[PDB]
Symmetry: C2
Subunit: 47 residues, 2 copies
């Protein structure tokens, strides 16, 4: 509720510094990473 | 600086409850009144 240009952008950035979806995507990939490490090590060990 | 309907009216009314011009008009007429009283009394006295 304002007439000031740029207030919307600053206020949204302050309210939601990082969106939930991006945090969750990062978490999912990071949590899957160790399984990838183990699988790649297993592949390397054989041949 | 707002998007709220009616904010302009309320804020103007609070800032300037009575305009200077109307106060000055009232003052001028009121200050002239006693001379009017004296003149009308003088007219009444004669005839």
């Amino acid at each position: 509720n304002t007439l000031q240009p740029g207030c919307n952008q600053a206020c949204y950035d302050r309210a939601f510094p990082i969106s939930h979806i991006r945090y969750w995507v990062f978490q999912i990939i990071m949590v899957c990473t160790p399984s990838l490490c183990f699988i790649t090590y297993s592949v390397h060990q054989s041949a």
